[PDB]
């Protein structure tokens, strides 16, 4: 019996610590975690970690945890996070856990300015956040200032509008009162439905240059690829539905997307590093994989997760 290797896995609301044996694959580690939290819609997630060089990487299940440059410290830090997003929140997230985990992960991104958000929408989203955290507004329980310790708005709006904390509390609160009677799980889904319609939602961006040296954005996401101008990361200039894509490939830095119709030209671009061109392809394979999967008949496992969820409501 060799020396145990401790690992610290953490979800958006839980912290797990357990030892693994030297030859544990990422797959096995992933499962223990998933079984501990009672998650089943595992296809969206993955274990995130930093390697020696400090590059944030996704743990590979088919390889030993030990032999992936997992930065060395004790315990070994991993972040359980969603790698892929659903095409439709209300139709792919069944278990209430897969829901609060997405709810949390997306709100962190909205909050962190990672997913652009207009001020109206932010306020609105905040209202659904508080209703989920505090329940029904009650003039007795939530007196002036109940929303002072909370982080509710995306900095980019606080900067863009210098209202006071109280001023903001007033706008959010007004909306908090509108959700009188709503259920916790319903407030988070209510949040997600609104979020999922944002332009930068579930999009992975990468700085690229085309044949000339014009700076650009590549947006790998659930439905295909997209090319964005540098100034506008919202609306794409050239889209690429999985449907009209023959194959995608790359060499050192030159990346190429071949159309399924030979009439359309091949889109070419260049990535900074190899490590970043590898990640792009990886995302494609995963998103395209799920894209297909959700067009196939519901598997005889996903099949009744949905029925027990019609009982719990």
């Amino acid at each position: 019996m060799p020396k145990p290797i401790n690992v610290r896995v953490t979800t958006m609301d839980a912290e797990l610590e357990f030892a693994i044996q030297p030859n544990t694959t990422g797959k096995q580690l992933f499962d223990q975690v998933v079984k501990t939290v009672g998650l089943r819609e595992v296809w969206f997630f993955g274990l995130q970690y930093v390697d020696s060089k400090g590059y944030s990487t996704w743990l590979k299940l088919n390889k030993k945890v030990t032999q992936q440059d997992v930065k060395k410290e004790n315990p070994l830090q991993f972040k359980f996070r969603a790698k892929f997003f659903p095409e439709d929140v209300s139709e792919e997230l069944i278990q209430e856990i897969t829901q609060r985990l997405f709810f949390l992960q997306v709100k962190e991104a909205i909050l962190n300015d990672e997913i652009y958000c207009p001020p109206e929408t932010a306020v609105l989203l905040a209202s659904y956040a508080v209703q989920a955290k505090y329940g029904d507004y009650n003039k007795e329980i939530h007196k002036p200032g109940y929303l002072a310790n909370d982080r509710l708005l995306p900095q980019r709006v606080l900067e863009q509008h210098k209202l006071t904390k109280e001023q903001w509390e007033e706008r959010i609160q007004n909306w908090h009162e509108e959700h009188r009677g709503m259920l916790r799980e319903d407030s988070m889904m209510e949040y997600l439905k609104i979020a999922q319609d944002l332009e930068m939602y579930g999009v992975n961006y990468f700085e690229i240059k085309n044949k000339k040296g014009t700076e650009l954005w590549l947006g790998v996401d659930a439905l295909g690829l997209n090319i964005y101008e540098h100034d506008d990361k919202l609306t794409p200039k050239i889209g690429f539905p999985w449907s009209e894509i023959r194959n995608i490939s790359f060499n050192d830095k030159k990346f190429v997307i071949k159309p399924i119709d030979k009439k359309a030209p091949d889109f070419v671009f260049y990535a900074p590093r190899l490590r970043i061109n590898k990640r792009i392809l990886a995302l494609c394979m995963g998103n395209h994989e799920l894209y297909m999967r959700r067009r196939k008949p519901d598997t005889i496992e996903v099949q009744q997760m949905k029925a027990q969820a019609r009982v719990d409501s």
Binding site: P4, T11, D13, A14, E15, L16, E17, F18, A19, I20, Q21, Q32, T36
Partner: peptide, 9 residues
């Protein structure tokens, strides 16, 4: 070995 320490319900 196995799961020894988790914190969240």
């Amino acid at each position: 070995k196995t799961h020894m320490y988790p914190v969240r319900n």
